[PDB]
Design a protein around this ligand. Structure first.
Ligand SMILES: O=c1cc(O)ccn1Cc1ccccc1Oc1ccccc1
Length: 134
């Protein structure tokens, strides 16, 4: 009944490119990068009314965010950044912006074929994370 229905479900990571380099650009330290980089998260997306929930489950860290499109919220990220986040739906792409300490990173999620593709950008570094249905 909504366009964002295409994102709902349970998703598993199938490939990753440039995640270590993205985390370096974020300022994540060595041990966290190693552990986080080994993770194989699942992402569970649900919608209930105007509220979207995105859970991330892994052996490293489990996260859960609930939010309304366009409405800012405070988020503690898996690497323990305290950020101010806003998520919008722009031409079919979920656009998640995180701001902290005068920095910004953007996470875009889109459906491409049977995949859910997450792109994360910090400065000039782009990481691509491809998820498939569980
Ligand atoms: O939510 C996601 C999901 C990813 O696949 C890749 C990155 N992030 C956000 C993220 C940024 C930096 C460090 C970790 C992190 O999220 C996780 C969470 C659990 C496991 C791996 C990455």
């Amino acid at each position: 009944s909504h366009m964002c229905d295409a994102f709902v479900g349970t998703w598993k990571l199938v490939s990753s490119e440039n995640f270590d380099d993205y985390m370096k650009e974020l300022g994540v330290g060595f041990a966290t990068r190693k552990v986080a980089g080994m993770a194989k998260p699942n992402t569970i997306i649900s919608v209930n009314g105007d509220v979207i929930t995105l859970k991330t489950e892994s052996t490293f860290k489990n996260t859960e965010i609930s939010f309304i499109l366009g409405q800012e919220f405070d988020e503690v990220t898996a690497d323990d950044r305290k950020v101010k986040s806003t998520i919008t739906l722009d031409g079919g792409v979920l656009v998640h912006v995180q701001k902290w300490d005068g920095k910004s990173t953007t996470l875009k999620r889109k459906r491409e074929d049977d995949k859910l593709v997450l792109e994360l950008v910090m400065k000039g570094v782009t990481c691509t994370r491809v998820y498939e249905r569980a």
